[PDB]
Design a protein around this nucleic acid. Sequence first.
RNA 1: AGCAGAGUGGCGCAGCGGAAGCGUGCUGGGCCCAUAACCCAGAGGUCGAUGGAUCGAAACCAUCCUCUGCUACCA
Lengths: 422, 266
Amino acid sequence: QATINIGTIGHVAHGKSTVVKAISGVHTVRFKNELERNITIKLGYANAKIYKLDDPSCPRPECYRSCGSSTPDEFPTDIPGTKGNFKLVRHVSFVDCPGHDILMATMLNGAAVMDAALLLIAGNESCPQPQTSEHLAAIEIMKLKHILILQNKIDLVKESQAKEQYEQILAFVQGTVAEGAPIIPISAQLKYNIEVVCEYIVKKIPVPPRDFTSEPRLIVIRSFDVNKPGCEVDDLKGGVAGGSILKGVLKVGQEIEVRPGIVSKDSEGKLMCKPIFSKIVSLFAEHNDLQYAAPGGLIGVGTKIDPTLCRADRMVGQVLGAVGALPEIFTELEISYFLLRRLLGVRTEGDKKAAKVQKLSKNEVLMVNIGSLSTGGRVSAVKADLGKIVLTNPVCTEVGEKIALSRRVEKHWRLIGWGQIR
Amino acid sequence: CRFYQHKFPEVEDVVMVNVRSIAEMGAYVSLLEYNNIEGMILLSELSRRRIRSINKLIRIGRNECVVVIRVDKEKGYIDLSKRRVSPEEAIKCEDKFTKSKTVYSILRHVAEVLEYTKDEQLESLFQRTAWVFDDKYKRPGYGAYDAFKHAVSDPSILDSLDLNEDEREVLINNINRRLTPQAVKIRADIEVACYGYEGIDAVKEALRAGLNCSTETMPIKINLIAPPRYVMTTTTLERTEGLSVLNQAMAVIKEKIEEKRGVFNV
RNA sequence: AGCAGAGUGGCGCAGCGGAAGCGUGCUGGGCCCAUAACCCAGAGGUCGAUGGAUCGAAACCAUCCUCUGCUACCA
């Protein structure tokens, strides 16, 4: 299954497929083929098995040696050991977030259900690069600090440039946790020092305490239909949710409720929403059958919902509770909030436009990323430490946790501040 | 020979002429509508315009839609015009001619089961097949009977047609080869575009209901080609049988979905 | 992946059991002192593939082949 969710976030032009296939062995993929124009801009999924020969390096199935195929310029070979079967240490899960700035709201959502991260830095561009800081800050807000910085694209980048970049990032982030996070330079054109990464992810990132006894909550981020185009009438199936569970052991045959709900017909107001109920058909993770779905892992829960809800990606950031979950489904919400004194996620060589942003004005639409949900809503009352927001589609608030608040600076939204629900 | 009971055309009868060769005045063409009887086109009237062109890569084996001005049954000369044409429009005549040719081929054998082709005593053969059809009245009526016969299987060997030589061995599997049919296949597209979570269930229920109806009657089959999009494809040989299937399919969509409530487009 | 379209001369592209078309270039010659437009012949044909029912498949039938498109992605 899975034990931890390590995320693979990283700004434009570092190469995703080479690094993702080295760590998991499962390709990051989704629509267009044209696998991506540059680096993956979709929310990729992948799981993997991490075993040892009693060595800090992680074998392949063929554990005698491993000859890469990253480049035919030279032969990159590494040796994990010699063969006689290897001991399974754990089953790991990844969360490949978008690597592009416009997709920030999606990157936030996907990130918010991980248990650790890997900041994929690229040495090609600017030294205190916008997105590195954006990522790091969001991570410390959500409730994580289990980060391993990875210098992913320094294959042709000289050692002065690459040294200056790690220095400037680590010096800018002087108020964000990063001093207890290692910085592992690797090759992505010769897959070198990959074996030492395997030692790091088992060290810096154990399994955090998971609450089995507590009531099941599944947060769905990806939508999958298994009926698909060309289905037969008596080959009928349910609709499958790619979600991570962050609380409770969800068992097979259990009934689960999707709690933001669907709005009642001919509503004259903003209420009323009614949750949808679906019975769990199957609990699939990796490529191995399971009867349980332990928390701390990203699992494909097939449920008895019908094709229309899974025919496109429409279940992004929905909260699912088993069953008749107590969590309130607000339509208008009381945010406590604070703002950054800089504009996060933007800053170029001329140092534009990380200038301090003006105060929020009422009746402006802002993206409130609450939980893994992403709703848009307008601010109806605006006091400094008390704003009232009215949301277009209702938000199930599992706990008052955190929020991330963004404002439409130009073409798309950009992160301005965070806070906590009251 | 020819399918028609009469041996000659009449004034202002639209015919199709095979241009055999160009010589002097114009061309000594053969009317193919009535056997292979000789006629002629130009000298005075045929052209409608002059542009100093009439062929380039238009070779031979071709054919003109013409109308009969003067016909001489005794003398065997038929003065023809193409300039007269307006409701006698060439495309429609050509379409009619092709259909007539296949009908002629059916009526001129007929003939255990080689077929043969040719030749047999000629007046008798034509009289018992094609002349009798023309008699059985009139030309519209013959066309209708012929069409019914053509349809393979509507119903298969029947009408009367008590005729003659034996004659069912030929009717059974010469005629299908002779014609050929082609084909007819028609898609029927249905999109049921629900987006409640009750509506989807309603569509699914409707599809199941549809299957039950299909089994009950015996014909097709609806197939899901995308989550809201459904295709049945209906073949028709009796023509109007596809209408009956379409009506049933529509009714399932309209009544069954309604029960648990949904929306549809068809 | 399932699905709407296509299979023809270089290109455009008629056509359907008793026919490899026509448009455009192509090349020669003519008219004219000569070219041009024009005219004529010349030149360009697995009609995807695999067969079958058949007196005969350019035509019926089934499959395979491809691009053109769809819910927009299918653990």
